[PDB]
């Protein structure tokens, strides 16, 4: 009889889940050993004070110090920061020593400078009131870090985070590592690692978020009134509804979608300025509108394109500045009218009351090019003209949630920004 | 009788072309007045020492100092630099004073710092052996600047360069400015401004480029032998042929495309290492290949995606790191094999001899996901499976022209980089 020592750093939930599963499947005596730092773990392995460790990114240098299994799983990787910053917002970043993260951040953000640390306390003091703007580290730090009032941004869908593997003192547990490898790749264990870990970390992040709601002292018994824009403009029970509602679920607030008939002349934004509703989306955050409501961070980025009569002047123009003498149709007070007024200063635009009228103008040769957002233009075709691929997307703008300009909305909007971050927006967008 | 004074700065070819055209059409006595600086021109206008000026970007502040016509034309705008740098490569940039360029560069590249100058000599000394890395200025500077051995990058398809207009002392030539405006927008004059100016500046840039060929001292009587990759891999008489051939035209070298049958086992790269041909494209600049040939700058950026059996495991995985236990098929020694070996370290990939065999493996359920480049995958469908939109483009890589590793190729490759810059690649790509 014996005992296999497997290394752990901080809250090593994947090492626990994986090796409990293995311990039990092969009837193995596992013994977890806490190491105060990830690089402590690495020395333990090549040395031999520990038999196994997980979550180690394989490298060519590394395979010459101790022996690797093939990658067994992903590793959730976060930017920890007071406020929830992004990578391209930092000039200092804390970096766990010995990790693959040194190379990753200099390869993708070489200007930031890294400051090395050892373990959670060191990381925590660097952040906890220090010079470091943010720390990049694994799921091991999530639970203790969010306790200390920190926020995260999941980096795995932001950067190519390499898969991860189980490792062993070189030439040591060769046969056992093989069996462990083959078991880990099984349909069962893989399905278990995907879901339980995702569930595990999303729950910690929800709890932190929900504690913020409570700390905000807003009345969660209040039914938030929501309106969705249904005047042909930019987007919509689709992308916007899912983001708003699921964010409302993220925060354990109750939201109710409300409608009448409206709107083409009965603006919902008026309802928002009335304070007769609390939330309105989508809203494309113009300049005109920027001050009349509070805004969540963006959650979609529409592609402005030009719609032209088919077969008309193809490849004559390669970008919209060369339309100096073409007739461009926009809708009055619409965001695209503003856009062109910046982009093509002092130029005559032709204004219309509606998309319908805007389109019919193009068809009647009243006008030659009209401004639409791509996704909306594809929609119209499904339910005789086309896009000028040459010019193509001449602009990318922002869609956000708007909140009524009062104290409640001031508190809601930053909260909704976080709920949106934690969402899988890409999936929703695809769906539609 | 009288005389209208219209302002000019340096080689103001658009002011000449436009106002000659107007002078003649309305029977007007024009008198050009050289101003040593663009901001000299502006003061002349609001003052009244000059009756007209062109190429002035309209602004809200500006319209309160002198009066604007509506935009009449675009303005070719260049980064001037020793070597031909790009904006995101500079920490210092020279900026003409009074221009719209101050605002444009800080809005798109705030980190660079601007250093103001007055006129071509000032600009030229800043560049000519100075601290400035590069100057951003209009077509006015093109001919004198390229004389002084400078290179350009056309910024108009790089940045939103606002259209441009004719301007006048405030409340002065009101009626005449109207007639001038309406004439300029005419089908005729517009067509004249598009083509003659484009022709004019492309010729100056060709001449500079061709002088470089001559200065290189390479034998332009030599017929360069070119091969195009025709083993299913990344791209191809299409994108690559147009870029290579038209670049060959750009440089007044003679290139001849050569083929046999080959190649799936008879690599053209071997022909390149043989020195039996001079040029090979496309070639996706791996690491494996990076040192065996000289490479032009990239001219296309393929989208690596995963091809999967239809209806199989949709939305189970959102990026390729989560394929740790899926069977991925690549071609042996292919670029994608290398890619995955970086991206999914120490993981078993299944290797094949060909695309054909790779595909049939996916169909035979030998394998579950295979790596293709998007454009190539669309091709196959046209002449039962699909892409995993969820993962989507998990990588963007580079396509370049490769040149044989000898002195001639060492000279050709940098030259071909310039010829490619001056090309309209977007148009070619579209076409295909
Ligand atoms: N205890 C940890 N998982 N620390 C982070 C490790 C990061 C990365 N997987 C590496 O081995 O370089
Ligand atoms: N002579 C010139 N065109 N100088 C550049 C002017 C740049 C820009 N059109 C402006 O008026 O601000």
Residue numbers in the entry:
A (entry chain A), B (entry chain A): 48 to 283, 291 to 437, 443 to 491
What do the study authors state?
C-di-GMP is synthesized from guanosine triphosphate by diguanylate cyclase (DGC) enzymes and hydrolyzed to 5′-phosphoguanylyl-(3′ → 5′)-guanosine by c-di-GMP-specific phosphodiesterases (PDEs). CdgH also plays a major role in c-di-GMP synthesis by responding to the presence of bile acids.
Additionally, the two tandem PBPb domains are stably connected through the packing of the C-terminal portion of the α8 helix in lobe-I of the PBPb-I domain with the α7′ helix in lobe-I′ of the PBPb-II domain, placing the two domains perpendicular to each other. The length and shape of the density correspond to an L-arginine molecule, and isothermal titration calorimetry (ITC) experiments confirmed a very strong binding affinity of L-arginine with the tandem PBPb domains (Kd = 1.21 × 10−9 M). In the CdgH PBPb-I domain, the α-amino group and the arginine side chain also interacted with E122, which was not observed in other complexes. Structural superposition of the PBPb-I and -II domains revealed that the L-arginine liganded PBPb-I domain adopts a more closed state compared with the unliganded PBPb-II domain.
